[PDB]
Design a protein around this ligand. Structure first.
Ligand SMILES: Nc1ncnc2c1ncn2[C@@H]1O[C@H](COP(=O)(O)OP(=O)(O)O)[C@@H](O)[C@H]1O
Ligand SMILES: Nc1ncnc2c1ncn2[C@@H]1O[C@H](COP(=O)(O)OP(=O)(O)O)[C@@H](O)[C@H]1O
Ligand SMILES: Nc1ncnc2c1ncn2[C@@H]1O[C@H](COP(=O)(O)OP(=O)(O)O)[C@@H](O)[C@H]1O
Lengths: 516, 517, 520, 98, 107, 65
């Protein structure tokens, strides 16, 4: 052969850049993952082992390598766990593709073959999994507690885990619904107090204060969202105010009060007794004169609220955004039983509004703690608890850890490839060998031999089941089912699903064109 | 001092290379995208990182890439014409034209003149065009067979697209839209709604020409015997499309005077509109809530926030008129519509017509997670409606998958037996350029192209004018049984536009570049 | 001053350097010779692109900084006025004579002696063309064969698909603007326009002027048959400035007063149109709704927003004057025309003003239609040489057989007469013979045939077979003898080709030094 | 079959180069003469050939030009057999000079 | 020329053995074409003797005997007709002596 | 892989490769059979050479100074 045109150099260029991101993030896998040192350009340096944080602080410039970074973000949104395992799997599949492409196999044949391994792979993991009952709050508690022990906070897991179990079971119909929205459960935190002090509020809780308003309470409020800024007359175009004497100067104040009250009169006609002012910085969102007129109308001032915080208020009470007072009406109003601002010792000036009385399933968690870090890790842990619980709602099943799913997957896929015909045999065998990088990485981090660990487990899986996996707590191979080290099925399934689609996407890249 | 300071001239030796190297490069750029197993391609503009994207559309690749070579710009402009006009064959035109110039560069190396090459290609294009005409198959009767052909043609156009996975659902949407049309192939009557949510399989359909717009605040959900009056003018407030004119404001009384002066202007304009004696008003600019109740009191449907396509499409669906200005009453054509009902698809109020004059129109309701999914869904689907509409105007069809390209190449080789000397060698290269199309479709899929393509030659050479590439199994099979076919006018324009494009490059022998400013 | 870094080139090496500059322009253009000529790709400075094989258009866009090349480009301005089509024949013949001269400079002959021989051989060849020529319309003025000559001319262009229709309009156009007996056809009186859409078969002749401007209102009469046209600078309305009025209305007290004065000027001037007897009122600016409302009641069509040079041409074509203000109107300043129509183009709102004369005129415009602007552009030049082909036949119906038949016959006469010149100009006369062969030898090359075999085969055919000259079948027709193929070039053209070519060779030969100061 | 079709064309293309080289050495346009013979033999006329004397195509039966059958048969076989040996080789082992 | 084309096919990812399979099949059809084109002379020996002169004129081309090639077409054909046996040219002697033109060659 | 899949999916008895481009696989029909002692010594000598090469990690040879 001549091989004059060489478009394969771009495949090796994308595979090398993709494999480089995986080789760096490989050592940080598992509880015993070796930490990594990141140095910001200013001079600051930090140490961490979370693979998600390392990829963000890498400043990836290659297109193919960026696909692994965006891939890891997809795993966080879908599953919330296994972020590092995905990038390691994709790097090994592409490294395995480098051996197949040298043999003269086309990327399309490799791409279609990997999908067949993915189709059979999901059947292997789903068959050997352990189904559980979602309404059973006993399994969800120990599942997140034992998993949270592997997270940063190992002591306060027993308090924050059942707060999330009840928060999900409250808003989600147990064992009836399959989809869950984590945005429907907001997590508020303030300094002071301790982790033991928490409250799962059925309504909503905010962080901003209603000052300088003196109402402090509005019962049976018809909450409304208005984005246009209420204030005195303002014009962006070139204008000039006329003042003939002190009377006209003071008359403008009387005409300035009218412009603020004219828009309040239209709001008063709709019965809107609480207004949600969108956070704005480009101009005065709520002037001083507007406070007393709103106090006259007995309206509570809620301003400087984030859109995401308004998004939680949107589905909670059913309020719509209003860009102008002329479009403000009564149909776009939420509801509330008793509005008030509570100021406890450690909870701070929170806006607690209960009794929404609207179609919606939402709750909110109040949290307290001495330092910012004490409350920071509390909310970080609640997300992982909600994420792992979300994985069980979509996929009511469990599986063992320690890379045991990768060994049963690699073991039976090699048997599945013997029955296949054509190029799919070597393409599926290479898919099986690529899975062995995960447990060999766990064995390496645990001080064991990477080869003898996976080599011993491949025999225990041929004879036994998926219970055999690496146990880093004891430093050797053990029955993971007895150690209570499990993960949901969606993590291992979504990992193979999203990783293979990225490998298929990277394989289909023939070349890149620089536009302008 | 012949050409310096920006001004350049490429001599016959170099311009012959630069003309082909520029055109052949564009062909080899997007030949990988040819076929259902086409290879993807990354597009990343220099200096900015947000412009990243991935696609396997040969048309989208040529639109975004800039071109400095004049020979390549001709081949790219001739390709964009195929995308905007026909909607299919943008990649085959670029590949077929480039493969012809690649072979032509080998002919001129043999001291074959470009004019001698052009003479053979003109005779080959006639024999090649005659082959499709004989093998083409029309369907006047048996609408079931004609309906099945539209489904097969829809799958071919949607191949190597975003909607290729669930094409079985979209083949029923595009064909039903063109089947419900059954007449003039005006794609203006075929609206495409784009709304968030749901997978691609959740794409609904409406035959009453559903709209992608909500109207008013509290409008009637049903109107009987509505008379359509479309318009285009400012109707919300004053100083519409006026910049520089200001208003003096000394107190809130003058603002109240503007409120009265506004209501006075909206009153007079609402009077002229109702003087027509109508029951339904449409305007491109938004309708303020004040004139809405004036139309509401008259029972007129106050449609607001129409777009350019809305005025262009609703005029013929309801049989109305644009009628931008409404100064004089009873001097424009009022449309015809039985019912204008409200419909909710995707958590949004939509306008559903019924019993309109020339009610063969329809609308395809797409569904997706974001707008990037719906945008590409509209492009590939509109491309299918283009060729499908062309298939109704011309019911002739030809077998794809390398059957048509190989059949035309065989007639050229037969024509090479009865021809003068140098024209034979030039026509032989025209056939090889056509045979390289299935060679690229097989190479991109990973199959042995030299085995499949050479087998098709022995097939077509001894009868059997149906064999083609079976991308499913990776072998040769009858295209009629497998259900693969393409329009005749598409393959016709692809043959002619590719020959005409390459003919322009050979006629060129010296590029002239003056001093750029 | 500025002697330092001054470019200089002198001696015999300069003459060979000047010849090398001319050959670069001739070798560039010899490929675009004939109907099968290879096109040229132009890259405009503003990013535009076009393709054409026209010799004049190639020289116009060719940005050459060499001074000898610029002189060769200046010859096109003098050649296109007489021939129009084959400016390539002069540049190819000039470059051929210069190449053969390089063989004579090595022999030690002075450049002036070479120029003296070409001037002697040119008179030998130009005398030979007058003998073998033939007439078409000798002693009678006829339109049958004259139309057929132009039909073969347009066939060389992209408009060949519609070459038969434009030839008839070309004969009526030239015959209208001038008489064949007068033998004075002016290109200034002839204009060509066009617009995208339609096909080239929709080419029409408008005896008068056409401008892409619409009436003052669609409700105006679409037919002004009477020959009374007013051409004012301002419209018949309250007078306004050229840019902006900026009327100051403080309150309603000024509105009702100025509206009366304004309404008075509306009625005064609109009624003044019928006072002077004018039916059509063409104005540089547009009319207001109050004005068009009064024009309709009076049945007074008017044109709006007419351009600067458009107002000038309407006065010349219709025979009127550019009236500066309504107070200067009179019976003499009204234009004349037989029919004024508004012609749209399908769904486009162009609506060009069509002023017809309904009789023979002295100025005619040519409206072209097609599906592409650049093909319309090349279509415009396709008639310019046709006007020269008709104008040349009108100046002299005598013509010579083209397709290379004339050049091969003259080369035999120049070769024989060279034996009678006992002087150093003899070598130049033989060089003139070989240089004449480059035109026909270039046609066969551009068609894809052996040049020398096709050249000498026609020579012996011109010497042995018959005395009438025979050309080359470059279009791959049946055979030679282009008289049967009806490929005939004008006699004045061939004489100007050999004349302008010998002049261009004489000017470059008598130049022996170029000087220019460089950047200091 | 598929791949064997491409190899047969190169065998025919090699035979067509013989009259090409005979015409090139004589100074005639080999592309016209050889392509005209191809167009001739493809539709009857199995006696056409080259006329080096006149420089065109003529009937070999009429002009009186012919060659022995045993000579052409051995030229075809000795060439294909000789080319078969070289094409079958993929590695050359050079030994030490003595 | 066969190897010049085979080098091109090997660049196209075509195996040498696959090419030999085609050349072997091609050599069969080529030999069959020669037999259908060959025209023997079972009768009309004068026509056969005329053909032998054409073999001599074709074989003697590109040699020094072009000046009098028409003479050597008769000698070589005449001497062959005298043999009427095996092709052993040992019975046919050749003499090389100077003096005289090529047309003076005796038999 | 096609022959290997035929040795499992199509039928359990062993099947070979059709290198001579005969009818099909299943060399038993084509009558292409090798000796059992041949194959036993083939992979045995091959393994013995691999072990002999794998158990060598130093090739020392003195140079000429
Ligand atoms: N306590 C543990 N004992 C054994 N294996 C563990 C333990 N915790 C995590 N693992 C393994 O480490 C891998 C990575 O876990 P985790 O850190 O939650 O995801 P990531 O590394 O992607 O952030 C998992 O595949 C799991 O099997
Ligand atoms: N199912 C199929 N089987 C075989 N060939 C196909 C199939 N679908 C599409 N093709 C081929 O893919 C080529 C490109 O199709 P398409 O994408 O519609 O045009 P373009 O690539 O020019 O945009 C066509 O020439 C057609 O022959
Ligand atoms: N239809 C024709 N058939 C044969 N020869 C032609 C024809 N038209 C022009 N020629 C020859 O080609 C030469 C140049 O032709 P053309 O390109 O039309 O003019 P120019 O070169 O001035 O643009 C002329 O000298 C003439 O002899």
């Amino acid at each position: 052969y001549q091989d004059r045109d060489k478009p394969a150099q771009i495949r090796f260029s994308n595979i090398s850049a993709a494999k480089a991101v995986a080789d760096a993030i490989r050592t940080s896998l598992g509880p015993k993952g070796m930490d990594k040192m990141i140095q910001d350009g200013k001079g600051d340096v930090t140490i961490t082992n979370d693979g998600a944080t390392i990829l963000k602080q890498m400043q990836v410039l290659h297109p193919a390598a960026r696909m692994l970074v965006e891939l890891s973000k997809a795993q966080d949104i879908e599953a919330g766990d296994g972020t590092t395992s995905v990038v390691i799997i994709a790097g090994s599949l592409l490294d395995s593709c480098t051996k197949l492409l040298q043999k003269g196999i086309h990327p399309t044949i490799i791409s279609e073959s990997f999908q067949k391994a993915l189709e059979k792979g999901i059947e292997i993991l789903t068959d050997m999994s352990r189904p559980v009952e979602l309404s059973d709050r006993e399994t969800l508690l120990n599942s997140a507690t034992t998993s949270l022990n592997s997270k940063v906070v190992s002591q306060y897991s027993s308090l924050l885990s059942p707060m999330s179990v009840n928060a999900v079971m409250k808003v989600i119909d147990p064992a009836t619904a399959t989809s869950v929205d984590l945005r429907d459960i907001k997590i508020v935190k303030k300094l002071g107090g301790t982790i033991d002090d928490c409250e799962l509020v059925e309504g909503l809780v905010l962080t901003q204060k209603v000052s300088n308003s003196g109402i402090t309470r509005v019962e049976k409020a018809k909450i409304g969202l208005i984005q246009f800024c209420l204030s005195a007359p303002k014009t962006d175009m070139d204008n000039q105010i006329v003042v003939s004497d002190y009377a006209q100067m003071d008359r403008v104040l009387r005409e300035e009060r009218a412009y603020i009250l004219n828009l309040v009169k239209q709001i008063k006609k709709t019965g809107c007794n609480v207004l949600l002012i969108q956070k704005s910085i480009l101009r005065d969102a709520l002037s001083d004169l507007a406070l007393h007129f709103l106090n006259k109308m007995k309206i509570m001032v809620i301003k400087d609220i984030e859109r995401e915080d308004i998004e939680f208020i949107c589905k909670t009470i059913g309020t719509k955004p209003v860009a102008h007072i002329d479009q403000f009406t009564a149909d776009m109003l939420g509801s509330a039983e008793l509005a008030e601002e509570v100021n406890l010792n450690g909870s701070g000036k929170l806006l607690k509004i209960t009794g929404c009385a609207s179609p919606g399933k939402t709750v909110t968690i109040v949290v307290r703690g001495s330092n910012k870090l004490v409350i920071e890790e509390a909310e970080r842990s609640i997300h992982d608890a909600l994420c792992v619980i979300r994985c069980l709602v979509k996929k009511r099943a469990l599986i063992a850890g320690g890379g045991a799913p990768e060994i049963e997957l690699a073991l039976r896929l090699t048997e599945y490839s013997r029955t296949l015909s054509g190029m799919e045999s070597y393409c599926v065998r290479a898919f099986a060998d690529a899975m062995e990088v995960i447990p060999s990485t766990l064995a390496e981090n645990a001080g064991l031999n990477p080869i003898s660990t996976v080599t011993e487990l491949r025999n225990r899986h041929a004879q036994g089941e998926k219970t055999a996996g690496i146990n880093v707590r004891k430093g050797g191979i053990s029955n993971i089912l007895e150690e209570l080290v499990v993960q949901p099925l969606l993590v291992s399934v979504s990992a193979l699903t999203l990783a293979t689609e990225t490998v298929r996407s990277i394989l289909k890249i023939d070349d890149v064109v620089n536009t302008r | 001092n012949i050409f310096k300071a920006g001004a350049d001239e490429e001599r016959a030796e170099t311009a012959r290379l630069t003309s082909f190297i520029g055109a052949i490069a564009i062909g080899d750029l997007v030949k990988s995208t040819l076929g259902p197993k086409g290879m993807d391609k990354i597009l990343l503009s220099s200096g900015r990182d947000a412009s990243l994207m991935v696609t396997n559309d040969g048309a989208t690749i040529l639109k975004n890439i800039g071109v400095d070579n004049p020979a390549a710009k001709v081949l790219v402009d001739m390709s964009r014409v195929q995308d905007d006009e026909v909607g299919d064959g943008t990649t085959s035109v670029t590949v077929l034209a480039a493969e012809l110039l690649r072979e032509a560069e080998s002919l001129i190396a043999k001291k074959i003149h470009p004019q001698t090459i052009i003479a053979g290609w003109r005779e080959a294009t006639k024999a090649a065009r005659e082959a499709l005409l004989s093998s083409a198959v029309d369907h006047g009767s048996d609408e079931v067979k004609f309906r099945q052909d539209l489904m097969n043609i829809a799958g071919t156009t949607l191949s190597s697209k975003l909607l290729t996975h669930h094409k079985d659902h979209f083949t029923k949407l595009a064909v039903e839209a063109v089947l419900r049309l059954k007449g003039s192939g005006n794609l203006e009557a075929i609206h495409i709604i784009k709304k968030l949510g749901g997978s691609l399989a959740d794409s609904y359909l409406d035959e009453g020409f559903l709209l992608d717009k909500k109207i008013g605040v509290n409008q009637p959900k049903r109107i009987e015997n509505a008379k359509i009056l479309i318009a285009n003018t400012g109707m919300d407030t004053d100083k519409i499309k006026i910049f520089g004119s200001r208003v003096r404001v000394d107190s809130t009384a003058k603002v109240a005077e503007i409120e009265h002066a506004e209501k006075e202007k909206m009153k007079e304009k609402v009077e002229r509109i109702l003087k027509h004696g109508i029951n339904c008003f449409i305007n491109r600019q938004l309708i303020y809530n004040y004139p809405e109740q004036l139309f509401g009191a008259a029972g007129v449907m106050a449609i607001e926030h129409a777009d350019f396509a809305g005025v262009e499409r609703l005029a013929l669906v309801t049989g109305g008129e644009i009628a931008s200005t409404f100064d004089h009453p009873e001097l424009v054509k009022l449309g015809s519509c039985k019912l204008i009902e409200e419909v909710m698809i995707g958590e949004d109020k939509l306008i559903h017509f019924s019993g309109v004059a020339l009610g063969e129109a329809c609308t395809i309701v797409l569904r997706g997670a974001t707008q990037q999914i719906l945008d590409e869904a509209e492009r590939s689907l509109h491309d299918a409606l283009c060729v499908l509409a062309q298939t109704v105007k011309d019911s002739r069809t030809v077998y794809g998958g390398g059957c048509s390209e190989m059949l035309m190449a065989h007639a050229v080789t037969q024509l090479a037996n009865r021809t003068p000397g140098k024209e034979a060698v030039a026509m032989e290269s025209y056939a090889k350029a056509l045979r390289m199309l299935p060679t690229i479709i097989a190479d991109n899929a990973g199959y042995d192209s030299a085995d499949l393509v050479a087998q098709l030659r022995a097939a077509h050479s001894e009868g059997n004018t149906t064999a083609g590439l079976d991308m499913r199994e990776g072998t040769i099979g009858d295209m009629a049984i497998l259900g693969i076919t393409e329009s005749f006018q598409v393959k016709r324009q692809v043959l002619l536009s590719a020959a005409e494009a390459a003919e322009v490059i050979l006629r060129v022998d010296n590029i002239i570049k003056a001093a750029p400013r | 001053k500025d002697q330092d870094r001054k470019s200089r080139l002198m001696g015999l090496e300069a003459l060979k350097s000047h010849i090398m500059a001319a050959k670069a322009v001739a070798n560039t253009m010899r490929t675009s010779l004939g109907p099968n000529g290879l096109d040229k790709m132009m890259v405009d400075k503003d990013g535009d692109v076009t393709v054409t094989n026209d010799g004049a258009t190639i020289l116009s866009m060719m940005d050459v900084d060499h001074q000898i090349a610029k002189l060769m480009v200046e010859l096109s301005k003098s050649q296109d006025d007489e021939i129009g089509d084959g400016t390539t024949g002069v540049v190819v013949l000039a470059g051929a004579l210069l190449e053969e001269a390089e063989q004579l400079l090595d022999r030690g002959i002075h450049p002036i002696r070479i120029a003296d021989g070409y001037e002697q051989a040119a008179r030998v060849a130009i005398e030979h063309l007058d003998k073998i020529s033939d007439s078409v319309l000798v002693d009678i003025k006829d339109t049958e064969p004259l139309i057929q000559t132009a039909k073969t001319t347009l066939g060389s262009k992209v408009v060949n698909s519609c070459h038969r229709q434009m030839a008839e309009i070309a004969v009526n156009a030239v015959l209208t603007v001038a008489d064949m007996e007068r033998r004075d056809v002016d290109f200034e009186l002839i204009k060509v326009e066009g617009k995208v859409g339609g096909r080239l078969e929709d080419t029409k002749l408008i005896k008068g002027v056409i401008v892409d401007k619409d009436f003052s209102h669609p409700q105006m009469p679409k037919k002004v048959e009477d020959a009374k046209i007013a051409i004012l600078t301002c419209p018949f309305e309250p007078p306004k400035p050229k840019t902006k009025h900026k009327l100051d209305v403080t309150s309603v007290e000024d509105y009702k007063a100025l509206q009366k004065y304004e309404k008075e000027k509306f009625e005064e001037m609109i009624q003044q149109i019928k006072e002077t007897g004018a039916n059509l009122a063409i104005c540089q600016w547009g009319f207001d709704d109050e004005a068009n409302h009064l024009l309709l009641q009076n049945n007074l069509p008017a044109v709006r927003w007419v351009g600067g040079p458009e107002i000038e041409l309407i006065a010349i074509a219709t025979g009127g004057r550019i009236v500066p203000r309504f107070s200067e109107l009179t019976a003499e300043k009204l234009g004349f025309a037989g029919l004024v129509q508004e012609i749209s183009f399908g769904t486009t709102k162009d609506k060009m003003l069509v002023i017809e004369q309904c009789k023979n005129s002295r100025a005619v415009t040519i409206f072209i239609r097609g599906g592409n602007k650049m093909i319309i552009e090349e279509a415009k030049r396709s008639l310019h040489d046709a006007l020269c082909v008709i104008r040349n036949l009108i100046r002299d119906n005598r013509v010579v057989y083209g397709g290379g038949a004339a050049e091969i016959s003259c080369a035999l006469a120049v070769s024989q007469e060279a034996d009678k010149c006992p002087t150093l100009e003899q070598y130049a006369m033989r060089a003139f013979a070989d240089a004449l062969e480059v035109i026909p030898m270039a046609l066969s090359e551009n068609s894809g045939m052996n040049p020398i075999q096709t050249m000498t085969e026609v020579r012996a055919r011109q010497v042995k077979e018959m005395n009438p000259a025979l050309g080359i079948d470059c279009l791959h027709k049946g055979t030679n003898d282009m008289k049967q193929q009806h490929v005939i070039e004008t006699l004045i053209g061939k004489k100007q080709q050999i004349s302008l070519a010998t002049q261009m060779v004489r000017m470059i030969l008598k130049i022996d030094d170029i000087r220019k100061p460089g950047e200091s």
